[PDB]
Design an enzyme around this catalytic site. Structure first.
Site, mmCIF file in Angstrom:
data_model
loop_
_atom_site.group_PDB
_atom_site.id
_atom_site.type_symbol
_atom_site.label_atom_id
_atom_site.label_comp_id
_atom_site.label_asym_id
_atom_site.label_seq_id
_atom_site.Cartn_x
_atom_site.Cartn_y
_atom_site.Cartn_z
ATOM 1 N N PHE B 25 0.822 -1.206 0.000
ATOM 2 C CA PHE B 25 0.000 0.000 0.000
ATOM 3 C C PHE B 25 0.858 1.259 0.000
ATOM 4 O O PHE B 25 0.558 2.215 -0.724
ATOM 5 C CB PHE B 25 -0.943 -0.020 1.201
ATOM 6 N N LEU B 28 2.441 1.531 -3.575
ATOM 7 C CA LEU B 28 1.494 2.030 -4.569
ATOM 8 C C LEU B 28 1.107 3.477 -4.291
ATOM 9 O O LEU B 28 0.803 4.220 -5.231
ATOM 10 C CB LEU B 28 0.253 1.133 -4.648
ATOM 11 N N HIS B 29 1.128 3.899 -3.021
ATOM 12 C CA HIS B 29 0.925 5.308 -2.699
ATOM 13 C C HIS B 29 2.048 6.175 -3.255
ATOM 14 O O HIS B 29 1.790 7.251 -3.812
ATOM 15 C CB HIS B 29 0.817 5.487 -1.185
ATOM 16 N N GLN B 30 3.297 5.721 -3.116
ATOM 17 C CA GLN B 30 4.427 6.453 -3.686
ATOM 18 C C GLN B 30 4.369 6.471 -5.211
ATOM 19 O O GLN B 30 4.689 7.489 -5.841
ATOM 20 C CB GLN B 30 5.747 5.848 -3.207
ATOM 21 N N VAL B 33 1.696 8.969 -6.165
ATOM 22 C CA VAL B 33 2.203 10.324 -5.978
ATOM 23 C C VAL B 33 3.125 10.709 -7.131
ATOM 24 O O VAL B 33 3.021 11.812 -7.687
ATOM 25 C CB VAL B 33 2.901 10.437 -4.608
#
EC number: 3.1.-.-
Lengths: 298, 187
Positions: B25, B28-30, B33
């Site tokens: 998670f 995939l957030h990075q 972004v």
């Protein structure tokens, strides 16, 4: 009769040093000599212990030395001399069948990938392992692996890899003394939190002297993860070579004693009733003899 | 929004799958972004509501070009051992749509008290009398735990899947894959 000895203590082969950590920058790892080690800090959230990199660093510097001893089949304290002679004959027969070929290759894999970097490898986009062969205080032969190409599941081959495999096999056979300084380099990120081995301020992180460290037995349990000959289901990779093949993460124990695949039944088949197991099972048996134990009846 | 990709955590003898979900998670957030866009969905295919368990698989809903740029992004390095995935194939046609939301909580009364120092300049005893210690919210939802480079505190991100509707609504997606008004198919 040829019963099992009441005391069957086996010393640990592949002795690991107490792995430190330290912080630094990528593309400065050639000058990784005076890198400042990370420190365990108490932070109030109740106060807990946290360890993390500083702002001007993105690479870990876990360093430990591994000594390959040899004499894997020799027990430290055996009650029965006839059992010790028969077990030494069986281990020597294994050596003539294969001269620690696959075990040293898989141990060179667990050196080559940073499995000793347990939770410091999952969030890393670039992992590097440097292994120096210290002999009479000097670097006899250097190695610089990559844990990104060498996967944690498959068991492949590579030329420098096989060179490390013959070095570890010569150490395990007893033809020389092997001392390897292993320095890891994982790009965990700028200032990200690292995972040292945890001592038991509700929770504390273990250190040695003004510098946080990972325990030796964690590095040893990471190095033992070569066992793929257990009855694997659900796509699980290698597990640590343990008696009755147990893992704490899944909460279950492969190589169940109700099956004839645990380490002790394979020993009593191999060295007592002369029921020689498969090549993979005797590989697992010699790996468990390499890791040591307190084996024997009561 | 037509294509989906299923990333299943291969089991690990070192970690229970909750930390693998947290690491995936955060990665995939990075990636979201760095890439940009808000047409990237997130689901949990084996989400059991009995014990608020996340499951063992993760579902990403997006377009063809966005998923191709996501796989072309180098965020996936270092995660090939713990995860395995197929291809960005299309979703089935008769699939009901549900929403995904991040439900935060005011679990710390002291944080809101320190907020009210910065808004009304009240005293500590005025904060304790105005806001008692029973205002903490306990949330029985599945959650992942994460830390940020901007804010070094470790935060918990609760994920809740909405009721199963019959159609999709035109809405964006956050950088975590959660919906600010968007919807994802369920199958």
């Amino acid at each position: 009769i040829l019963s099992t000895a009441s005391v069957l203590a086996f010393e640990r082969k592949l002795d690991p040093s107490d792995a430190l950590m330290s912080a630094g920058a990528w593309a400065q790892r050639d000058a990784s000599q005076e890198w400042p080690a990370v420190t365990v800090r108490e932070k109030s959230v109740q106060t807990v212990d946290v360890a993390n990199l500083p702002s001007d660093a993105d690479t870990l510097k876990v360093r430990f030395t591994l000594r390959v001893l040899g004499g894997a089949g020799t027990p430290s304290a055996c009650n029965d001399a006839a059992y010790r002679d028969k077990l030494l004959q069986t281990v020597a027969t294994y050596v003539n069948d294969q001269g620690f070929a696959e075990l040293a290759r898989r141990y060179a894999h667990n050196l080559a990938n940073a499995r000793f970097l347990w939770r410091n490898r999952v969030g890393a986009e670039a992992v590097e392992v440097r292994i120096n062969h210290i002999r009479q205080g000097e670097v006899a032969r250097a190695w610089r692996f990559d844990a990104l190409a060498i996967g944690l599941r498959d068991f492949k081959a590579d030329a420098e890899l096989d060179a490390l495999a013959e070095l570890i096999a010569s150490g395990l056979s007893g033809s020389g003394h092997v001392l390897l300084e292993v320095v890891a380099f994982a790009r965990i990120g700028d200032g990200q939190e690292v995972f040292p081995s945890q001592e038991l301020k509700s929770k504390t992180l273990y250190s040695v002297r003004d510098a946080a460290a990972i325990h030796s037995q964690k590095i040893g349990n990471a190095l033992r993860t070569i066992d793929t000959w257990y009855p694997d289901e659900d796509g699980l990779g290698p597990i640590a070579v343990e008696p009755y093949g147990s893992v704490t993460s899944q909460g279950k124990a492969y190589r169940q004693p109700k099956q004839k695949l645990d380490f002790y039944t394979l020993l009593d088949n191999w060295v007592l009733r002369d029921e020689a197991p498969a090549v993979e099972q005797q590989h697992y048996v010699i790996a468990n003899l390499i890791r040591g134990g307190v084996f024997g009846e009561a | 929004m037509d294509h989906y990709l299923d990333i299943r955590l291969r089991p690990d003898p070192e970690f229970p799958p909750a930390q693998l979900m947290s690491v995936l998670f955060g990665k995939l957030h990075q990636a979201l972004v760095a890439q940009g866009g808000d047409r990237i969905g997130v689901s949990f295919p084996d989400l059991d509501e009995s014990r608020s368990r996340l499951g063992e698989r993760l579902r990403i809903h997006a377009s063809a070009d966005d998923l191709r740029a996501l796989l072309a992004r180098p965020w996936l390095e270092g995660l090939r051992d713990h995860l395995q995935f197929g291809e960005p194939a299309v979703v089935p046609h008769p699939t009901p749509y549900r929403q995904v939301s991040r439900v935060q909580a005011k679990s710390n009364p002291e944080r809101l008290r320190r907020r009210l120092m910065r808004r009304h300049d009240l005293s500590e005893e005025e904060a304790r009398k105005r806001i008692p210690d029973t205002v903490a919210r306990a949330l029985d939802l599945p959650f992942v735990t994460l830390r940020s480079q901007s804010t070094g505190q470790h935060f918990r991100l609760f994920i809740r899947h909405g009721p199963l509707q019959v159609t999709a609504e035109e809405g964006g997606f956050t950088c975590y894959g959660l919906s600010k008004g968007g919807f994802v198919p369920w199958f």
